Amino acid sequence: KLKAKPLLLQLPIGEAKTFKGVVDVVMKEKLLWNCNSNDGKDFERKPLLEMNDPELLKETTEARNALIEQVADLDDEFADLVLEEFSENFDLLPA
Amino acid sequence: HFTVRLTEAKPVDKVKLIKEIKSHIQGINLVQAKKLVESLPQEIKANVPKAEAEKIKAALEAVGGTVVLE
User: Fold this and answer.
1) Enclosing H/E stretch for B44
2) B63, B20 in Cβ contact below 8 A?
3) Handedness of CA B32, B33, B38, B41 (dihedral sign)
4) Separation between Cα atoms, residue A5 and residue B62, nearest integer Å
5) Do B30 and A69 make contact, defined as CB atoms within 8 angstroms?
6) Does the beta-carbon distance from A79 to B19 stay under 8 Å?
7) CB neighbours of residue B18 within 10 Å
8) H helices of chain A, where?
9) Which of B15, B29, B34 is nearest residue A77 as measured by Cβ atoms?
10) Contacts of A90 in chain B (CB under 8 A)
11) How many degrees, rounded to 5, is the angle at CA A31 between CA A26 and CA A35?
12) Are A76 and B16 in contact (CB < 8 Å)?
């Protein structure tokens, strides 16, 4: 009902009072917040818990594939680059 | 009904062909479309009506594609 195609870039951990962190799509990392003020003065970067959570890994890679598909269908030059170099990789490049 | 065939893909229209294929098939993915476009000669659609075949061939040739009908 807004009539605009969105590009999801982040996946929350929880919804109802359990949203304690986010998972980035372009960077394949998780950001956590455990404090009251400034939530640790920074965000804690432990990328996908070092290849340990299969569900998180699968969701993150599926989100990355969806984002890549969206951006490639939208832009033509990026579509050309995906066509030319990173087709079967599905993991083009970090950032 | 008619059948459509993509004969050759132009080196400079490689970028524009894939988007048209994606918008025309409506059921294919990006890498599958790329394999379709790199595996010429290869069929695109079959048992397509005449008007739809004309529209898709016109849209495919306006972006730099070699299209034939059988």
Assistant:
1) none
2) yes
3) positive
4) 26
5) yes
6) yes
7) 24
8) 54-74, 76-84
9) B15
10) 31
11) 160
12) yes
